[PDB]
Design a binder for this molecule. Structure first.
Ligand SMILES: COc1cc(-c2cnn(C)c2)ccc1Nc1ncc2ccnc(-c3cnn(C)c3)c2n1
Length: 261
């Protein structure tokens, strides 16, 4: 099977993922170049769902020039019945990669972190707060992480929504959501890449889990490691008071991401 986007024909190699009314396909152009095409069926979409998709496309388009840490969007076709997005094809999403890895190299960990910080920082510059960061939002493209989405349009699974990365300020006001909320979530991804688990993975009851995230009395454990800077980064990221939590610009000037070994 094949598909057409703005006159250009693409052969379907395989379907990478599915989620809701969305499907991602690995495809080839006439010159045998690989792309990932995202197909959205708008035949059952309401005006709330339509506006989410339009907002995500616009931001991905705007941010293209600003950073190479944002997944590339080469073309798109939009009608009343469907959406086609011609994007770069990555090797694997971060979540799938994390589940497969028995141990993460320290160097790989730092390089990925820098990519995450640069990607998130760029969105922040335009006034966008993701508020829903998790490993699945990142794609590995040639040993470089890139941000896939702004957590608005839809969630996809390779061919269940975790609360393990949720910042305290979100649960408290049930606005306090700020660029610092993303620091907590990025902090949780780094924590997982360091200790093999999210800061609150252990508590099974989701209500107890949510209560532990917002409780200063509940203390997050930070076992000692050879990278003292990494330990500091973690602790600065996972401060429950957003006002006391470190910022992305500050993180980019930290020893952990600027100084190796
Ligand atoms: C070979 O390509 C893949 C394989 C996997 C994969 C393979 N095994 N598992 C478990 C996941 C995930 C992403 C990709 N690549 C890829 N490239 C561009 C994309 C553009 C937009 N969205 C996705 C995406 C989002 N979620 N997923 C699973 C893929 C994209 N995924």
């Amino acid at each position: 099977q094949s598909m057409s986007v703005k006159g250009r024909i693409y052969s379907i190699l395989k379907q990478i993922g599915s989620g809701g009314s969305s499907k991602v396909f690995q495809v080839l152009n006439e010159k045998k170049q690989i792309y990932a095409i995202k197909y959205v069926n708008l035949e059952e979409a309401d005006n709330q769902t339509l506006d989410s998709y339009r907002n995500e496309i616009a931001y991905l388009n705007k941010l293209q020039q600003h950073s190479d840490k944002i997944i590339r969007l080469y073309d798109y076709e939009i009608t009343d019945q469907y959406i086609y997005m011609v994007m770069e094809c990555g090797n694997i999403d971060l979540n799938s990669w994390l589940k497969k890895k028995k141990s993460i190299d320290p160097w790989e960990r730092k390089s990925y972190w820098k990519n995450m910080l640069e990607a998130v920082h760029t969105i922040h510059q335009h006034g966008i707060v993701h508020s829903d960061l998790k490993p699945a939002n990142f794609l590995i493209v040639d040993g470089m992480l890139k941000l896939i989405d702004f957590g608005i349009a839809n969630q996809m699974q390779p061919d269940v929504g975790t609360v393990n990365y949720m910042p305290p300020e979100a649960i408290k006001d049930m606005s306090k959501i700020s660029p610092k909320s993303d620091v907590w979530s990025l902090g949780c991804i780094l924590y997982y890449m360091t200790y093999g688990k999210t800061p609150f993975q252990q508590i099974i009851n989701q209500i107890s889990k949510l209560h532990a995230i917002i409780d200063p009395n509940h203390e997050i454990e930070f076992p000692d490691i050879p990278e003292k800077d990494l330990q500091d980064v973690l602790k600065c990221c996972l401060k429950r008071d957003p006002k006391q939590r470190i910022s992305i610009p500050e993180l980019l000037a930290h020893p952990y991401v600027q100084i190796q070994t």
